[PDB]
A paper describes a structure:
RadD/ATP crystals were obtained by incubating and co-crystallizing 5 mg/mL RadD and 5 mM ATP with 5 mM Mg2+. The electron density of the structure showed only the density of the ADP molecule and no density of γ-phosphate, indicating that ATP was hydrolyzed into ADP during crystallization. However, in the structure of the RadD/ATP complex, an ADP molecule was at the same position as ATPγS. However, in our structure of RadD/ATP, Ser38 solidly interacted with the Mg2+ ion, Asp117 was away from the Mg2+ ion, and Lys37 was in the middle of Asp117 and γ-phosphate of ATP at a distance of 3.2 Å and 3.5 Å, respectively. The side chain of Lys37 and Asp117 moved away from the γ-phosphate of ATP in the structure of RadD/ATP compared with the apo-RadD. Lys37 is located between the γ-phosphate of ATP and Asp117, which are on the same line and form an equilibrium state by the electrostatic attraction. The side chain of Lys37 shifts away due to the exit of the ADP molecule, and Asp117 will correspondingly move back to its prepolarized attacking water configuration. Crystals of RadD/ATP were obtained by incubating 5 mg/mL RadD and 5 mM ATP for 30 min at 20 °C, and grown under the same conditions as RadD/ATPγS, except that Mg2+ ion was added to the solution (500 mM NaCl, 5 mM MgCl2, 18% (w/v) PEG3350).
Author numbering: 1 to 82, 89 to 125, 127 to 434, 436 to 448, 451 to 578
Write the structure that this text describes.
Amino acid sequence: MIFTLRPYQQEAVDATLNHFRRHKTPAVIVLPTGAGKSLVIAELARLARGRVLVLAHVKELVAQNHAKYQALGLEADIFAAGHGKVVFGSVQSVARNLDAFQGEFSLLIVDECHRIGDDESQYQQILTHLTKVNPHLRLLGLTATPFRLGKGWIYQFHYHGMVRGDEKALFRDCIYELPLRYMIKHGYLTPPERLDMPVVQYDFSRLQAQSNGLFSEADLNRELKKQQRITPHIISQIMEFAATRKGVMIFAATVEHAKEIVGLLPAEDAALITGDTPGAERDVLIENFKAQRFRYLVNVAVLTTGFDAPHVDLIAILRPTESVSLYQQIVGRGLRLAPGKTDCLILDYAGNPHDLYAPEVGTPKGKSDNVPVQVFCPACGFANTFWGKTTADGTLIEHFGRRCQGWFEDDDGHREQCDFRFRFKNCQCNAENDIAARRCCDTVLVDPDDMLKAALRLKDALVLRCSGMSLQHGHDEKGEWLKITYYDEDGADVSERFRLQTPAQRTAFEQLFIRPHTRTPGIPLRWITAADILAQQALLRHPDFVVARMKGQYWQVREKVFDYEGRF
Ligand SMILES: Nc1ncnc2c1ncn2[C@@H]1O[C@H](COP(=O)(O)OP(=O)(O)O)[C@@H](O)[C@H]1O
Ligand SMILES: [Mg+2]
Ligand SMILES: [Zn+2]
């Protein structure tokens, strides 16, 4: 041809080729922003039979992709506001002129395919036209951000064995992923430099995250306006370094941060991008920047399509990053190669740890001090990465995962997520299954809240809002026993007993108490006598509610509720 592929580019091509020689279904490739997505595009098109349509939502993406294609010495058409195998188009423009797209189309590539579900509405008109004309039309997505915290995952199965999204995902498969780690190790991107000790960080250890997992507009703009005096004190140091840098990208937390920054540095040498802007004004600021007509770009919406020019060489991070994906997306905005760019200066000011390579758990943290931890599935061996708390030594205090995420395929094409359940109910189903996939048969499972309300309107019933438990142990002519006593904030209490002597009794005790009560399900608790259990009571959680029925004379435990989540 006219071009030569790097090894990783040929991997991405062969991955795609193998997927569609076996499957009709959509696939995504995960490529960082400096990878040269045009080299994959051009090899697929050299091999294609139809034409190939390369769609973007953002017209500047359509123009960037058309330019980078023809920079290879190749011809292709473009369809936007104003001949070869490939057509480069925007969603709006192509959904308009569908009559001009009536030939053979074998492959449709969607750049930034994470955008697809951001309503838009014309896209599926395109999809259905192309599929009417081309029933076996193959669709490849490309993206650097498969997962946005708050929107979830763009694919379902990953070819490494994890499951990510539900049956809902737009792409059933992710078939190649190029790690930042590797692109930096082999020099295909600019190596990043995070200043070891920058002077005055913010104190975002006060993290009050919403349920989708994103810190709220209010909580940000307010909650550390207690330090809103340091907002000029830090831009001073940013200007210090920017003395010797071509383009600085600064990421605020809110418009109330980004404006209180855009005024605080030089007077017309900076600009402000956020979703609340034109339009024609963004089309002016994309020409001004990258052409370097100003220096500082301040933004709060990290979607920087157009401003990730190669000349940017310092990323200053003025916001806490909830997921690692947001951190990686932000640093990656400044990692492109430029002739004589030695590194990219990363200024981590907020409470943002040092893991450009962290695994993305893929769900909200929960407790703010939660880190990723890896738990091995006792069924299939797969290495899950759940949220957890780990001690100084790297040892596991808690992990929070509920189900193994590995998957497998037989030789009949039937594909299944592993079904090992770290948290369970009954005899077993997910903590939040409505119907028992299979037992007490397909019956309707009793919702915790209803079970508590039923038990409340019983007289022979006790319902204690458990504030903790205490263990005693003892012995007689049949061996040892362990007695657990649950109690609420007023010392109302109720207890149960477990003989530890016989192997059936040992086994029942692992079944009915250690497995519900352990903080590290899947990692077995090692113990010889009740004394070892007392010794390890920190590895045990206490129930959120206990229900005891009456007969006879004494109170007898019947139900324990863990992992509550619905108030009350
Ligand atoms: N196979 C290749 N042969 C020659 N140059 C390449 C190759 N792959 C990538 N490059 C160069 O590496 C850089 C890739 O950056 P870019 O084209 O901006 O990535 P993307 O378009 O994927 O965002 C470009 O400067 C490009 O010319
Ligand atoms: Mg490219
Ligand atoms: Zn498993």
